[PDB]
Amino acid sequence: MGLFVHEFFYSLLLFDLVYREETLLNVIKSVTRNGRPIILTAALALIL
Amino acid sequence: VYLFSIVGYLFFKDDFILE
């Protein structure tokens, strides 16, 4: 998506390079592991 | 946040005149 392909994206590559950073990955984790059925605890309020 | 600027901005130009 910049070979000859349109604008943007470049942004996407930046996002994943920073993801490849771990420590931020550790803090990122501070939101998925006990989160995989806790996206379901969102709809609690969305129903409440 | 920085991407979802664009994700809006592509399908929706800001369409802003006054606050």
Curated annotation (Swiss-Prot), chain A:
The chain crosses the membrane at residues 1-15. Inositol 1,4,5-trisphosphate-gated calcium channel that, upon inositol 1,4,5-trisphosphate binding, mediates calcium release from the endoplasmic reticulum (ER). Undergoes conformational changes upon ligand binding, suggesting structural flexibility that allows the channel to switch from a closed state, capable of interacting with its ligands such as 1,4,5-trisphosphate and calcium, to an open state, capable of transferring calcium ions across the ER membrane. Cytoplasmic calcium released from the ER triggers apoptosis by the activation of CAMK2 complex. It comes from Rattus norvegicus. The chain holds residues 2404 to 2451 of 2750 of the full protein. Polyubiquitinated. Polyubiquitination targets ITPR1 for proteasomal degradation. Approximately 40% of the ITPR1-associated ubiquitin is monoubiquitin, and polyubiquitins are both 'Lys-48'- and 'Lys-63'-linked. Belongs to the InsP3 receptor family. Homotetramer. Homodimer. Interacts with ERP44 in a pH-, redox state- and calcium-dependent manner which results in the inhibition the calcium channel activity. The strength of this interaction inversely correlates with calcium concentration. Part of cGMP kinase signaling complex at least composed of ACTA2/alpha-actin, CNN1/calponin H1, PLN/phospholamban, PRKG1 and ITPR1. Interacts with IRAG1. Interacts with CABP1 (via N-terminus). Interacts with TESPA1. The ITPR1 structure has a large solenoid CY assembly built around the central helical bundle made of the C-terminal domains from four ITPR1 subunits. The solenoid scaffold includes domains responsible for binding of ligands and regulatory proteins and is connected via an allosteric nexus at the cytosolic-membrane interface to the transmembrane channel assembly. Six transmembrane helices from each subunit form the central ion-conduction pore. The lineage of its organism: Eukaryota, Metazoa, Chordata, Craniata, Vertebrata. Residues 16-37 are cytoplasmic. This is Inositol 1,4,5-trisphosphate-gated calcium channel ITPR1. It is found in: Endoplasmic reticulum membrane; Cytoplasmic vesicle, Secretory vesicle membrane; Cytoplasm, Perinuclear region.
